[model samples]
Target: DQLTEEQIAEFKEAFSLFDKDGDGTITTKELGTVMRSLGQNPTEAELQDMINEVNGTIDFPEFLTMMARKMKDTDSEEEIREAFRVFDKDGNGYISAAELRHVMTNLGEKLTDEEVDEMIREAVNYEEFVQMMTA
Candidate 1:
């Protein structure tokens, strides 16, 4: 694995937020939602270019792999926390980990047997998750 599985896990988390419908593709309006969840705002120009003109679509696998080129990103640690915050307590919405897990495994990338077999005990906390982000 050129990109370690843990790193890929983070990317999937971010990309899944982008690909909302669990539809396998990041389409149109979700561009803004995904960007917002990723710790950045989508510029008007960005929406106009891809979102406005057409029902923009990009596959999560391709998108995830492309983002790997810059895996060490600008303050990705901060973004990871921010993204986790969304589901941390479902602060302002209804995205529960149960759903995220469902979409992650059933809707998109099925969890690897290797990962499942690890038989994780304690769930990852923010500190543990952030540690995994880049460390």
Candidate 2:
């Protein structure tokens, strides 16, 4: 997935917090605890199925995959913002067409310069960029 160090750190920190008792793996009980802490109450069967993915305890890699799945399913705004930051290469609080084209190309995406310009037209700043995508 080519996740950045910062992105990996975010997941690591989250997994650490959820992996209570300082264990390297998260048990079904620990999963339930974290879910409840987040205001979600998963049923026993549901939790069992989740744990089953790892055959019992959820390790860091499995946890990371689970988190990634959740983020994708939710279309997380924070995740999108972080992606926007990556394209805003100079960190000037905005994304220029040049920046967009550069990033898209690096990601092996083929977008015409005109297409990039169109997307960047109404998204000169981060806030507008966020809105543009959300819309």
Candidate 3:
């Protein structure tokens, strides 16, 4: 299954954050920092396995694929909904066009007004947002 465009965009934004040096891959130290930031205290063995899985460096595609698998295997509906809430910004229920534009740009995905308008033409609610991402 392929990830939706929005999912790809979201992953790139997150990947950029981890790829602090603007390099294409996340180093071992960076990965460790990420795990700690997420409040995960992985054992040395577990961390080594994660590093090995990506041959010691994590690139965007690898990171995206791993995350998509986790979303399908580990994330519950409520978890997905909660993640979307962060982007809701104003908490007005539906994600407004302006919010979408601001968020996309903030995430390093510079979208044109027309593109944002098309994406939010119907004012996506959480369910619709989830569908768009998972579809």
Candidate 4:
């Protein structure tokens, strides 16, 4: 089922709020804050669960990759679009390594520029994104 326009809009708003520092992506800190805003202050164990959920082994970059991939796999198109709308902080057609880096940094993880660039180049195209969601 399609999300109502208002619902999608709300998702976008929430997504944007989580994208603190306004760089266009969400980090674990932002994700945790967003979850907290929704009334769940996840314990370290809960955070770990999210890590395991994404097969990330507690790595935030991996978590983001997992989250994005899971969104593609489990959410409807409208849902995915709303999520993208939220994460696309600048509303750009595509997200950049800087945006991802900002998100990771805020979440207390660090990634090298090369790694960020690699993820964007290797894993962040629209079609592959859609495929990950489907798989």
Local accuracy by lDDT, each model: 0.55, 0.64, 0.66, 0.55
- Candidate 1 stretches with Cα past 4 Å from truth are 1-7, 17-22, 47-55, 69-135
Q: Any idea what lDDT model 4 has? A: 0.55
* Model number with the top lDDT: 3
lDDT of 4 by residue, 9-69 (tens): 5545766665655345555566676657644466978775775565112233443353454
Clash count in backbone of candidate 3: 0
| Residue-level lDDT tens digits of model 2 in 1-135 | 434567568666666776656667666777777666654577989877877776366677776675566545345666666666764547777655676656655564666866666655545666675676668
Count of steric clashes across candidates, in order: 0, 0, 0, 2
| Candidate 1 lDDT tens digits, 1-135 | 246677677767887655546477665556567656765565789656644433357666555545454555544655655776554455443454455454445533567644533423223355563465346
Worst 10 residues of 4 by lDDT: 55-64
Model 3: pairs clashing at backbone N, Cα or C within 3 Å: none
TM-score of every candidate relative to the true structure:
0.36, 0.42, 0.41, 0.31
TM-score of 3: 0.41
Q: Give the better candidate number (2 or 4) by TM-score.
A: 2
Q: What is the lDDT of residue 53 in candidate 1?
A: 39
Flag clash pairs in model 2: none
Worst 10 residues of 2 by lDDT: 66-75
13 Cα displacement, candidate 3 (Å) = 2.2
